[PDB]
Design a protein around this ligand. Structure first.
Ligand SMILES: N[C@@H](CCC(=O)N[C@@H](CSO)C(=O)NCC(=O)O)C(=O)O
Ligand SMILES: N[C@@H](CCC(=O)N[C@@H](CSO)C(=O)NCC(=O)O)C(=O)O
Lengths: 222, 220
């Protein structure tokens, strides 16, 4: 690419896919640098100098290095979008989208990372019931947030959906999202998948991740 | 002002918003929400905030929640200058990263400890949960580096959000100054601001003493 934008990532990370989705909706070219987490490429001296959290995604926008999928997506829309539909400039509307992003970070992501991180770090394959309960609590809140609106922040697709949709696509690694229990979540996930660019970026990597972790568990709750 | 804050003082998330209101010199009405009586679960409350959390802000008929979202709103709407939440997009991205780090790492690590207590009366804390809190502090220590504040040389929303959250962490973990000298020094630095100590310190001590009195097992 000649945009000067570089994304450091791996496709099985939902946080990375948030950024790919954002770059796609903004029609931005970029260079994608695959970071091999299994080889510890995120822990190298040169990587950690740019991102001391040693996470993906990281964005290099023409010499400006930023990380955290939420912060990256908000930056990209404000800098590069031609309209504000994904991330409204109106302060009250922006506060709704921000709230949903902080909910993804603090509740949805946190609940599923609580399950997966012990696996990646310490090979833990036994998942306490308490952790599955916390995932369900987050799904119930999402179900209520969706209400009668098609998207997470209202009638239009926003960064709220591009952030939370991928995270929720990882949840089935640990919990079944039963449509009869979570019909609004289910309908929303299906609605996102009706957007070709979304399904193309999200669906196969999400399936790969879920199948992988489901093959690992030796005990899933009580 | 027509601004109303719904909250309780022992919540660090609520204190973030009180600190923001204070630095912006905004007058407001403080409506205490009695979480122990379930006032956050009433029909009227959940109609405005389906997450049934504090803080919630009513800015003249606009209801918003989540301390990070509230604080960002308040600075962009009401501040004279953008020092707490820069308009430059790269600087904003650093402050936002810090806020999302507070939400996804620091807050999540300590809520993982406290929530089972408040919901189910769990008083036995697995070592894994304490390890997660330490991992978050280690990252914070690296973020601080040699800069006095979390996002660099000036105080920002990064500090007003993360400082109060970190003031709750001693409920479960000791913040050892030999392991976390920069975190320690930063927490002391915030407390040298009179408005910060006045809002934060006594409620933080109350919370920490309360939960420390309840634990029957703290890790291994
Ligand atoms: N709040 C951040 C989370 C990034 C993250 O956990 N990334 C994982 C990959 S999986 O989704 C990662 O980089 N793990 C390596 C590590 O933390 O060491 C964001 O939204 O970008
Ligand atoms: N990400 C949100 C966290 C709010 C929260 O959990 N608040 C607690 C009080 S402790 O700090 C609360 O309202 N608990 C009641 C509940 O969730 O039912 C924010 O920053 O505002």
């Amino acid at each position: 690419s000649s945009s000067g934008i570089v994304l450091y990532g791996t496709d099985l990370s939902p946080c990375v896919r948030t950024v790919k989705l954002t770059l796609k909706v903004l029609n931005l070219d970029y260079e994608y640098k695959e970071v091999n987490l299994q080889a510890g490429e995120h822990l190298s001296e040169e990587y950690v100098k740019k991102n001391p959290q040693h996470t993906v995604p990281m964005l290099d926008d023409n010499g400006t290095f930023i990380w955290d999928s939420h912060a990256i997506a908000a930056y990209l829309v404000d800098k590069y979008a031609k309209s504000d539909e994904l991330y409204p400039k109106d302060l009250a509307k922006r506060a709704i989208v921000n709230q949903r992003l902080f909910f993804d970070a603090s509740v949805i992501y946190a609940s599923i990372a609580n399950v997966s991180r012990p696996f990646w770090i310490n090979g833990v394959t036994e998942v306490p019931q308490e952790k599955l309960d916390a995932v369900h609590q987050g799904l119930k809140l999402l179900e209520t947030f969706l209400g009668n609106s098609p998207y997470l922040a209202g009638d239009s697709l926003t960064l709220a959906d591009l952030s939370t949709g991928p995270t929720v696509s990882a949840v089935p690694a640990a919990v079944d999202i039963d449509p009869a229990t979570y019909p609004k979540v289910t309908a929303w996930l299906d609605r996102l998948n009706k957007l070709p660019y979304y399904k193309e970026i999200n669906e196969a990597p999400a399936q790969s991740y879920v199948a992988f972790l489901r093959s690992k568990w030796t005990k899933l709750g009580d």
